[PDB]
Amino acid sequence: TLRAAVFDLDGVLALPAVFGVLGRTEEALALPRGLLNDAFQKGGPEGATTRLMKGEITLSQWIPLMEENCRKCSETAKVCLPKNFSIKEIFDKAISARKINRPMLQAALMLRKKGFTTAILTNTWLDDRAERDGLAQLMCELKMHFDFLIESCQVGMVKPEPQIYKFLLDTLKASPSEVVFLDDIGANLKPARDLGMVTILVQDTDTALKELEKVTGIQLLNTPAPLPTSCNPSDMSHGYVTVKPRVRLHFVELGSGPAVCLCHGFPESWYSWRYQIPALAQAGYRVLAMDMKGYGESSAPPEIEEYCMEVLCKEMVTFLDKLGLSQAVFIGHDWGGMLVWYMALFYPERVRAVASLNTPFIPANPNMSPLESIKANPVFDYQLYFQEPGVAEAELEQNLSRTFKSLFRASDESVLSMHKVCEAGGLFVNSPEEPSLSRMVTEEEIQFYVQQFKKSGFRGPLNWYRNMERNWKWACKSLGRKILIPALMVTAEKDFVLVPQMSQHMEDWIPHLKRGHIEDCGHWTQMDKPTEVNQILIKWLDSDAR
């Protein structure tokens, strides 16, 4: 029975193959057929290319050797290489054109999810070209999805040499019959077949995957669209910043580029952005996913006033100051969305751009108490239930698994009644003790939240709703302002509290506002519709946030 799958890089996980460019150049330059491929492999195991692949020399040292073999091959064939003939330009173009073969990576992803040990085995080089970063980026993206990456230049062995295959088996800790090996070079497949491995000669991806699914007995072709890459908490870089003597803020950090600070809502975590973090970092951004004050590994002081918008905003500014960041793009959801609008209003110099999921920007009404305003709409009753210190804490901390299983459900999986929460005596009065696991979350994801909330519970998080008068007084100071920095409002069709129509007047205050809208999306936006959130945010960042 198969339990390991090995994939080649060039022509398998990455296309067009760097090899096939030798043939295209020959055709474009009307050079003899195979001339460039012949000079490339000149000398066989004793040649320049084999030394390169074994790590003996770098790609920049190899370039002039390849030039010399091209001269030699042209001399024998009685032909002339054109004037501006440059191996460097040829390879720079070839490497740059090579992209991840998405359906092949997806097949590798499915096998690993099904218990297979996955590996990349490749004949590669030590790239010291001025433009080496392109390749480093590709290898970085691919490698994360596999258990092992074996590079010829790092192990000092090359395919089709028999030793690299015995090295492969030792690393996999598997016998040959337990391994599927995919390669686009028949010669490099031969030693694996001879050892007893299942071998697939990759020409076109589709046929290779048909062979792959037939041999593993796992559906790899025609499968439903996959969810974006998530986060394993133990594999992330965790950051800690003391913003004031008793207050430390924790964050998860991934990527390089403009700083994007993600601000979760109630009662969530940095982990609510798990599907966005890898995607935004891959799109060219340095993602800082916060544990907001009161949550996870961030400090959770008991005092109500520690959670008013003015203090929360000041601490996020100090957070930027200590990290040495003059600005970040601020993206928030729910309570996080409310904070990001106020960051844009009070600290525009520190906000590169602002985006909110579900949370509209509604200006304070100076002629009405915020208590009055909340009472007017019956969908906001849960917020009145949250007012009395200790009440909501007791019900929410009673059974954490039940709390998170009951909350984190799709728009059609509701087990909760939002009207008359106070009157009924709680959110879970007529809700199950052991709710079914929502289609949106796994047991493992729920247990992560349970573990996070064991530290500080619900006091700090609930205190975010306990500053209505303080927040209204502060917001009133901003009534003569407009938000004029880049801004994005994302509405969720099925959020029954933060309804899309509540955002209808935002253009009066944010004239240049851009929008996104997600159909069949409930309140828990990021995990409800991650692909669509990713598409909207990446499109908007690339156009408005640089």
Rule CB under 8 A: say whether 326 interacts with a copy of itself.
Answer: yes
CA distance 525 to 154: 43
From 1-9, 207-215, 341-349, 413-421, give the range in contact with a copy of itself by CB under 8 A: 341-349
| DSSP letter, residue 44 | G
CA distance 395 to 115: 39
Among 496, 505, 508, 542, binds ligand B7H (CB under 6 A): 496
Q: Omega of the bond prior to 226 within 30 degrees of 0, cis?
A: no
H or E stretch covering 52: helix 48-54
Q: Give the DSSP per-residue string, 144-175.
A: TTSSEEEEHHHHT--TTSHHHHHHHHHHHT--
Rule CB under 8 A: say whether 259 interacts with a copy of itself.
Answer: yes
Is residue 410 within 8 A of residue 440, CB to CB? The reply is yes
Rule CB under 8 A: say whether 137 interacts with a copy of itself.
Answer: yes
Q: How far is the CB of 506 from ligand B7H (least distance, A)?
A: 17
How many Cβ atoms sit within 10 Å of the Cβ of residue 397? 14
The reply to whether 133 sits in an annotated binding site is no
The reply to whether 170 sits in an annotated binding site is no
Rule CB under 6 A: say whether 21 interacts with ligand B7H.
Answer: no
Residues 6 or more apart whose CB falls under 8 angstroms from that of 265 comprise 272, 332, 333, 334, 335, 336, 337, 359
Q: What is the CA radius of gyration of the chain?
A: 29
From 181-189, 401-409, 481-489, 534-542, give the range in contact with a copy of itself by CB under 8 A: 481-489
CA distance 216 to 543: 43
The CA-atom distances, in angstroms, between 412 and each of 329, 404, 415, 445, 523 are 33, 16, 9, 20, 11
Rule CB under 6 A: say whether 439 interacts with ligand B7H.
Answer: no
Q: Which does 266 bind (CB under 5 to 8 A by kind): a copy of itself, ligand B7H, none?
A: ligand B7H
Q: What angle do CA 263, 269, 271 make, to 5 degrees?
A: 100
Specify the residue, 336 or 486, whose C-beta has the smaller distance to ligand B7H. Answer: 336
Phi, psi of 163 (to 5 degrees): -60, -40
Joined tokens for residue 191? 């030693």
Please name every residue paired with 122 in a beta bridge, in sequence order, or none if there are none: 151
Q: How far is the CB of 259 from ligand B7H (least distance, A)?
A: 28
Among 46, 170, 204, 349, binds a copy of itself (CB under 8 A): 349
From 360-368, 427-435, 475-483, 495-503, give the range in contact with a copy of itself by CB under 8 A: 475-483
H or E stretch covering 33: none
The CA-atom distances, in angstroms, between 252 and each of 165, 227, 443 are 38, 21, 22
The bridge status of strand 14-15 relative to strand 99-100 is: antiparallel
CA distance 289 to 530: 15
Strands (E), 19-160: 99-100, 117-122, 148-151
Q: Which does 538 bind (CB under 5 to 8 A by kind): a copy of itself, ligand B7H, none?
A: none
Q: How far is the CB of 48 from a copy of itself (least distance, A)?
A: 11
Among 342, 382, 464, 465, binds ligand B7H (CB under 6 A): 382
Is residue 252 within 8 A of residue 38, CB to CB? The reply is no
Specify the residue, 69 or 406, whose C-beta has the smaller distance to ligand B7H. Answer: 406
Among 1, 84, 237, 367, binds a copy of itself (CB under 8 A): 237
Among 323, 497, 513, 538, binds ligand B7H (CB under 6 A): 497
Is residue 119 within 8 A of residue 27, CB to CB? The reply is no
Rule CB under 8 A: say whether 253 interacts with a copy of itself.
Answer: yes
Q: How far is the CB of 299 from a copy of itself (least distance, A)?
A: 14
The reply to whether 271 sits in an annotated binding site is no
Rule CB under 8 A: say whether 136 interacts with a copy of itself.
Answer: yes
Q: Which does 497 bind (CB under 5 to 8 A by kind): a copy of itself, ligand B7H, none?
A: ligand B7H
Q: Which residues form the catalytic set?
A: 334, 465, 523
Coil, helix or strand at residue 20 = helix
* Number of chain positions touching ligand B7H (CB under 6 A): 14
The reply to whether 25 sits in an annotated binding site is no
Say which amino acid occupies 35: L
The reply to whether 123 sits in an annotated binding site is yes
From 208-216, 233-241, 358-366, 491-499, give the range in contact with a copy of itself by CB under 8 A: 233-241
Q: Which does 427 bind (CB under 5 to 8 A by kind): ligand B7H, a copy of itself, none?
A: ligand B7H
Residues 6 or more apart whose CB falls under 8 angstroms from that of 204 comprise none
Q: Which does 156 bind (CB under 5 to 8 A by kind): ligand B7H, a copy of itself, none?
A: a copy of itself
Rule CB under 6 A: say whether 498 interacts with ligand B7H.
Answer: yes
Among 60, 365, 373, 411, binds a copy of itself (CB under 8 A): 60
Rule CB under 6 A: say whether 523 interacts with ligand B7H.
Answer: yes
Strands (E), 92-227: 99-100, 117-122, 148-151, 179-183, 198-201
Rule CB under 8 A: say whether 128 interacts with a copy of itself.
Answer: yes
Q: Which residue has the tokens 């698994």?
A: 401
| DSSP letter, residue 425 | T
Q: How far is the CB of 199 from ligand B7H (least distance, A)?
A: 51
Among 215, 325, 362, 418, binds ligand B7H (CB under 6 A): 418
Joined tokens for residue 187? 């010669």
Q: Which does 233 bind (CB under 5 to 8 A by kind): ligand B7H, a copy of itself, none?
A: none
Q: How far is the CB of 301 from a copy of itself (least distance, A)?
A: 18
Rule CB under 6 A: say whether 292 interacts with ligand B7H.
Answer: no
The reply to whether 122 sits in an annotated binding site is yes
Among 51, 402, 409, 466, binds a copy of itself (CB under 8 A): 51
Q: How far is the CB of 377 from ligand B7H (least distance, A)?
A: 12
Among 243, 522, 526, 536, binds ligand B7H (CB under 6 A): 522
Q: Which residue has the tokens 């600290």?
A: 347
Q: Which residue has the tokens 């492999």?
A: 41
Instruction: Tell me the binding residues.
Output: 8, 10, 122-123, 184, 382
Instruction: Tell me the binding residues for substrate.
Output: 382
